[PDB]
TrEMBL record:
This is Crammer. GO terms for biological process: long-term memory; short-term memory. GO terms for cellular component: endomembrane system; lysosome. GO terms for molecular function: cysteine-type endopeptidase inhibitor activity. It comes from the Eukaryota. Gene3D superfamilies: 1.10.287.2250. Residues 10-69 form the Cathepsin propeptide inhibitor domain. Transmembrane segments: none annotated. SUPFAM superfamilies: Cysteine proteinases (SSF54001).
Amino acid sequence: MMSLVSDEEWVEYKSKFDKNYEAEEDLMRRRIYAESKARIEEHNRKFEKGEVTWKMGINHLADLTPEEFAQRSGKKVPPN
């Protein structure tokens, strides 16, 4: 699903990220936040591949991606 990660995990992050955006904005972000954990699997599985030593870090947009980025103020959305 895409609701795996709610603003909850990100609120604690918002302080540590200097970018605080609550449930209202987070809602569209809830979908971007989902991929975020997917990313945690990203680097952790990489060195995990005797590849390099690189760990995940929860990307900033992992809460606000094009999902958020485009729906936050990317495409012109009329009042109708």
